[PDB]
Design a protein around this ligand. Structure first.
Ligand SMILES: *C(=O)[C@@H](NC(=O)/C(=C\CC)c1csc(N)n1)[C@@H]1NC(C(=O)OCOC(=O)C(C)(C)C)=C(COC(N)=O)CS1
Length: 446
């Protein structure tokens, strides 16, 4: 009430603070008003994941044979069955292929199948901004992921202005780069409104367009792979050839559910509890979103889709956590989607459940701890409020958005849950002053 005055009038605050297990809140300010959660969405994802999949779930990738092996020759298909493992690396594919060879397969009399049947429909959630789709933080969290589905490129201006700027990319990235970038003389009138753009095409083609001012060093750029299956296929095909394995057929995608072949090689991710800790400490969208469609797959035994994920999380929260989210909209796991819409009061029910079951979930220890390595290592409001070491909370940050959801231990040692949904802060002083006062008050007055 007094605090709100610290913020620009352009800003929208919805805030709830409640003692763990209490029937009534200590602070309740527009707590039923629905807001964009951004990355605080990951709290709900983590909880739904632990309940549905459990802390010991591991993502799985396999090479399977369908057919008889005669004289080093597979009579049939090689199936590379991807499982949305966010942490799969090129070297892992190389290792599985080394294992395939070692098992006695030198030749495939058949097709190489890139099986993505674990998932179906689009690899991008509803409500994701189109313009972010080429950025690594928003890379499609496909069934087929290798080195996070992100690659990097160097863009060099041409020595003579008007000449085409040129692109260097490492041999080990199966992408196709084209440049239509005009190098501008220093001081060109064109430089103010001529954009430098990336335009993705089919089969992991990328075209760079527009203008680049003459510059002395290359411009480093990182892009998201748009077609994870094709990318993973191309890497597998490279690794097969290097290991001297030949095949007569072609690389085909397999999207339809099917019975597994004989598993000849496999890679499993770290256990889910480990991945959810990375996810919560780093706000890792890819772990959040692979987990999210995995939940739907697991709950309903269908290829995982965004809709299946949303229905499953809603159900898990209602039936296992006794939280009816009502009119909340859950669109993804990471909070990237602009369709995600939730009130502090609803997220409070989620936090209350977590605090009440924390000896079981080992959840709170996974959230960023204020003043320690993580997203809250130094958040000036919290530091100045004197609450380093006292707040465990998930951030949700965007231009003009400063969300915080989690727990604080007060001066008297009571634990309080809080949801701070604060947006349109297009107007780092008013925010600091608000949070310094607010968290200082909660800590010392409870
Ligand atoms: C959580 O909010 C995540 N990002 C988003 O949700 C975004 C939009 C959702 C509506 C978003 C749009 S554009 C963009 N880059 N993200 C993840 N959160 C963060 C992060 O912590 O926020 C950045 O600000 C901070 O670093 C502090 C919170 C001040 C510490 C991640 C870091 O950003 C990356 N790209 O450097 C991962 S994305």
């Amino acid at each position: 009430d007094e605090y709100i005055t610290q913020l620009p009038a352009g800003a929208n605050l919805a805030l709830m603070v409640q003692k763990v297990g209490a029937s009534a809140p200590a602070i309740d300010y527009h707590s039923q008003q629905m807001a964009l959660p951004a990355s605080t969405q990951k709290v709900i994802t983590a909880l739904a994941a632990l309940i549905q999949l459990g802390p010991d779930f591991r993502f799985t990738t396999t090479l399977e044979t369908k057919g008889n092996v005669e004289n080093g020759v597979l009579k049939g298909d090689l199936v590379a069955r991807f499982g949305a493992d966010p942490t799969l690396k090129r070297q892992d594919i190389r290792n599985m292929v080394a294992t395939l060879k070692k098992s006695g397969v030198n030749q495939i009399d058949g097709n190489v199948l890139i099986d993505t049947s674990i998932f179906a429909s689009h690899d991008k959630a509803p409500g994701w901004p189109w313009n972010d789709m080429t950025q690594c933080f928003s890379a499609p969290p496909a069934a087929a992921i290798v080195d996070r589905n992100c690659f990097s490129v160097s863009l060099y201006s041409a020595p003579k202005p008007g000449d085409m700027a040129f692109i260097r990319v490492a041999s080990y990235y199966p992408v196709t780069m084209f440049s239509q970038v005009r190098t501008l003389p220093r001081g060109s009138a064109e430089a103010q409104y001529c954009e430098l753009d990336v335009v993705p095409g089919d089969l992991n083609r990328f075209t760079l367009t527009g203008c680049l001012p003459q510059r002395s060093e290359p411009l480093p750029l990182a892009f998201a792979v748009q077609d994870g299956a094709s990318y993973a296929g191309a890497i597998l095909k490279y690794e097969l050839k290097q290991a001297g394995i030949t095949w007569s057929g072609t690389l085909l995608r397999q999207t339809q559910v099917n019975e597994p072949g004989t598993v000849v090689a496999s890679k499993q991710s770290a256990p889910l509890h480990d991945l959810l800790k990375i996810m919560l400490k780093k706000s890792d969208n890819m772990i959040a979103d692979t987990v999210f469609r995995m939940i739907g797959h697991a709950r309903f035994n269908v290829p995982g889709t965004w809709r299946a994920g949303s229905d499953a999380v809603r159900q898990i929260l209602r039936q296992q956590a006794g939280v009816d989210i009502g009119n909340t909209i859950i669109a993804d796991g990471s909070g990237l989607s602009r369709h995600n819409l939730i009130a502090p009061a609803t997220m409070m029910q989620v936090l209350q459940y977590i605090a009440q079951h924390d000896n079981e979930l080992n959840f709170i220890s996974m959230l960023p701890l204020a003043g320690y390595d993580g997203s809250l290592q130094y958040r000036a409001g919290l530091h100045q409020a004197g609450v380093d070491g006292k707040v465990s909370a998930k951030t949700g940050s965007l231009q003009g958005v400063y969300n915080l959801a989690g727990f604080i231990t007060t001066a008297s040692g009571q634990r309080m849950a809080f949801v701070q949904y604060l947006s349109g802060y297009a107007v780092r002083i008013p925010l600091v002053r608000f949070e310094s006062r607010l968290y200082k008050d909660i800590y010392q007055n409870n």
